[PDB]
Design a protein around this ligand. Structure first.
Ligand SMILES: NCCSC[C@H]1O[C@@H](n2cnc3c(N)ncnc32)[C@H](O)[C@@H]1O
Length: 393
DNA sequence: GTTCGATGTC
DNA sequence: GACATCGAAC
């Protein structure tokens, strides 16, 4: 893993430390951020790098190198500036997740980090740890995935940043060659409050920040790229989540162990549907993408709502809104399943048309860009629906 | 119950 | 780029 030099340069441009200040690069390897900071600001700082792998630690003699797990490291003194690119990844079983440690080590991380939630991620733990290691008024500059802007797993992290200091977020996007990740830079200072959101433009000269919006009273809410138009559309109708209960499909292991489920087609059996069966405005009931089949009538044993025709919205087609009415009421292995709340009247056909409309695709692309390869529940529940498509009694 | 991906594989 | 994970995680 390397950080492109124009990304390093941009981050160094955002970094500051007082003369003689302590400057730290977590997960440093050969210390590219220490080196770049020194080149730009000179030698009158105490440079420290922390690296877990002895094969990777390779700092110049002007820096102190410590062999340690940064996440469990307890230095004698706090830092003025912490900068770098922390490891990204979920800690879990190797068949499914990339970061592999003893359960005991994962337990130490959970104990250490107040922001740890759900499956979480090393990059969230690195951010929390770094903030904890800052002196009052100290500065952190990290490049990390954009996913914490919007995802529930990072709610405690966002709330923590919001209360611990002031935050600037600079959208970069997919700037790591051969890595599929949309990135942001966070500049956090352990004083003051509020959020500033910035776009960037890349030129030969490097990255230039462009101020997008300011939220001086940010308390850790989801971060979005709002515009006059997104606001105007959001007040035009009721949030979709006010009209529907939003549920998810039963998961693959639930179907795989169910006695009614088969691995081959046969009389009275239908495919268990996936996102590949869902298209804008229609459902493919014939093709099998899950490897699983079952009697339609037994689908309700997995989720009661599989018995009832209802609206289905895609989760893993990227940041877009893809919807269809499941008229037949089939078993699904994937996607959101929307059930009208009490007193809600709908025009399924018109609502589906609206959800699939170009206006709606632009809306979610503006707000959430490419932070995650999904439409998530928190995005979906806020989609505006005017009373002509769906209206609450 | 439902979340997430330095995504996985074409 | 198309077209989406799918199951261990809680
Ligand atoms: N800063 C470059 C991306 S992160 C990759 C580097 O972080 C190191 N690393 C991974 N986990 C670490 C941890 N918990 N503490 C310190 N270094 C770590 C790796 O050994 C590798 O050199």
């Amino acid at each position: 893993v390397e950080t492109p030099p124009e990304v390093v340069d941009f981050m160094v441009s955002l970094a500051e430390a007082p003369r003689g200040g302590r400057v730290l690069e977590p997960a440093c390897a050969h210390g590219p951020f220490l080196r770049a900071f020194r080149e730009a600001h000179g030698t009158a700082y105490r440079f420290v790098g922390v690296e877990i792998d002895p094969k990777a630690l390779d700092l110049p003699p002007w820096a102190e190198g410590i062999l340690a797990d940064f996440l469990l490291w307890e230095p004698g003194e706090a830092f003025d500036l912490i900068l770098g690119n922390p490891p990204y990844g979920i800690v879990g079983e190797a068949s499914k997740y990339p970061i592999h440690v003893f359960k005991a080590v994962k337990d130490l991380y959970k104990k250490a980090f107040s922001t740890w939630k759900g499956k979480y991620n090393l990059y969230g733990a690195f951010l929390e740890k770094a903030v904890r290691l800052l002196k009052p008024g100290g500065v952190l500059v990290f490049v990390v995935p954009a996913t914490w802007l919007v995802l529930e797993d990072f709610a405690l992290l966002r709330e923590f940043l919001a209360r611990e200091g002031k935050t600037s977020v600079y959208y970069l996007g997919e700037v790591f060659p051969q890595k599929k990740v949309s990135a942001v830079v966070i500049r956090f200072q352990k004083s003051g409050k509020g959020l500033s959101l910035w776009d960037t433009q890349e030129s030969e000269s490097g990255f230039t920040p462009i101020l997008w919006a300011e939220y001086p009273h940010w308390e850790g809410e989801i971060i979005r790229f709002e515009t006059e138009e997104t606001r105007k559309l959001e007040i035009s109708g009721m949030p979709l989540g006010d009209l529907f209960h939003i549920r998810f499909a039963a998961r693959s292991p639930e179907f795989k162990k169910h006695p009614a489920v088969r691995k081959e087609p046969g009389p009275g059996l239908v495919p268990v549907l996936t996102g590949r069966n869902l298209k804008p405005g229609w459902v493919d009931y014939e093709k099998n993408h899950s490897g699983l089949w079952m009697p339609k009538e037994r689908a309700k044993e997995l989720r009661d709502f599989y018995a009832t025709p209802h609206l289905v919205v895609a989760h893993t087609k990227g940041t877009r809104v893809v919807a269809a009415w499941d008229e037949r009421a089939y078993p699904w292995r994937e996607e959101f399943h929307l059930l009208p709340k009490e007193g809600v009247r709908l025009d399924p056909s018109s609502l589906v048309q609206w959800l699939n409309s170009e206006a709606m695709q632009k809306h979610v692309r503006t707000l959430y860009r490419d932070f995650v390869p999904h439409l998530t529940l928190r995005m979906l529940e806020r989609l505006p629906v005017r009373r002509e498509y769906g209206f609450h009694t």
